[PDB]
Amino acid sequence: MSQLFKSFDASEKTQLICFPFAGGYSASFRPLHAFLQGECEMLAAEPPGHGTNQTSAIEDLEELTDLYKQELNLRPDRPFVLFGHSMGGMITFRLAQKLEREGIFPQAVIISAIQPPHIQRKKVSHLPDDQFLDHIIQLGGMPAELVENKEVMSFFLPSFRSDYRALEQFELYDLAQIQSPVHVFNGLDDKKCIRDAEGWKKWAKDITFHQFDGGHMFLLSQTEEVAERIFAILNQHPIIQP
């Protein structure tokens, strides 16, 4: 009972975007994937029109490899990028992510969105308050203790070493000096310095890394200048304007 457009060819690269938007990440990734990649599966979520067959439910992956390779199933697409909104959808994501990890462990391209304010309880020498807010998982007031799991798996928390080692359990004490695959960070409207600190700490930058933050923090909202400022420079990060 839902609409969902999709168009894959030779299983190049899966691109899931439910009601996306140009903004800046789109104009930045556009040329990034258009210059580094090409002929990639293009799909997106559409509004309800008329009962045709069934509801999307983010099942185009199999629905495609099956409705096309019905004759014989070999293997789905390795890469997969899912773009969501700043609202929240642990459900839709739960199916997508689960479908990915279950579809193929060794993935190349992968984008995480809806990055919640909460952070995997850990200890870092980033700031004297980092650990505080890390265990507080509030950043504006957000009561949740029995969802930290469904969030790290669905919401896709920012904490890389956490989720990573939580889904691979192979992470080492050293993660610096790493680059090859493709990935991008989306959301982090609340905290942005968290990813910049915990991100640069490893000095690792995949062949294609991007950062798209909004700004809804307690102070971020107060100073609209800083907000719009970051957004602009963010869209010009990869390509500066004349």
Q: In the 8-state DSSP scheme, what is residue 136?
A: H
Instruction: Quickly tell me which residue has 């899912």 as its tokens.
Output: 82
> Do 84 and 93 meet the contact criterion of CB atoms below 8 Å apart?
yes
- Give the tokens for residue 16: 């899931």
Catalytic residue among 2, 7, 11, 86: 86
Q: Contacts by 27-35 with C-beta closer than 8 Å and gap 24+?
A: 27/235, 28/210, 28/212, 28/234, 28/235, 28/237, 28/238, 28/239, 29/184, 29/210, 31/238, 31/239, 32/208, 32/210, 32/238, 33/208
Domain chopping of the chain, boundaries: 1-242
What type of residue is 167?
A: L
- Residues sharing a CB contact under 8 Å with residue 63, sequence separation 6 or more, in sequence order: none
What one-character-per-residue DSSP string does 157-177 give?
A: -S-HHHHHHHHTS---S---S
CATH number among 1.10.3720.10, 3.40.50.880, 3.10.450.710, 3.40.50.1820, domain 1-242: 3.40.50.1820
How many other CB atoms sit within 10 Å of the CB of residue 146?
6
Find the length of the chain: 242
Residue 86 designated active-site: yes
Find the Cα–Cα–Cα–Cα dihedral 117, 16, 169, 89, rounded to 10°. 40
How many other CB atoms sit within 10 Å of the CB of residue 235?
19
Instruction: Quickly tell me which residue has 């963010």 as its tokens.
Output: 234
- The technique is NMR
Give the bridge partners for 182, in sequence order. Answer: 109, 208
Give the bridge partners for 18, in sequence order. Answer: 45
- Give the tokens for residue 26: 């789109």
Beta strand 80-83 with 14-18: parallel, antiparallel or unpaired?
parallel
Q: Contacts by 120-128 with C-beta closer than 8 Å and gap 24+?
A: 120/148, 120/152, 120/157, 120/159, 120/162, 120/163, 120/166, 122/159, 122/161, 122/162, 124/197, 124/198, 124/201, 126/194, 126/197, 126/198, 126/201, 127/197
CA–CA separation, 162 and 171 (whole Å): 9
Q: What SS3 string covers 72-128?
A: CCCCCCCCEEEECCCCCCHHHHHHHHHHHHHHCCCCCEEEECCCCCCCCCCCCCCCC
Helix, strand, or coil (residue 63): helix
CA–CA separation, 108 and 207 (whole Å): 10
- Give the tokens for residue 102: 């279950």
CA–CA separation, 99 and 57 (whole Å): 12
> Do 174 and 150 meet the contact criterion of CB atoms below 8 Å apart?
no
How many other CB atoms sit within 10 Å of the CB of residue 136?
15
- Residues sharing a CB contact under 8 Å with residue 190, sequence separation 6 or more, in sequence order: 116, 117, 139, 140, 216, 217, 220
* Sign (positive or negative) of CA dihedral 222, 119, 183, 3: negative
- Residues sharing a CB contact under 8 Å with residue 219, sequence separation 6 or more, in sequence order: none
CA–CA separation, 184 and 112 (whole Å): 7
- Residues sharing a CB contact under 8 Å with residue 57, sequence separation 6 or more, in sequence order: 2, 92, 95
> Do 162 and 151 meet the contact criterion of CB atoms below 8 Å apart?
no
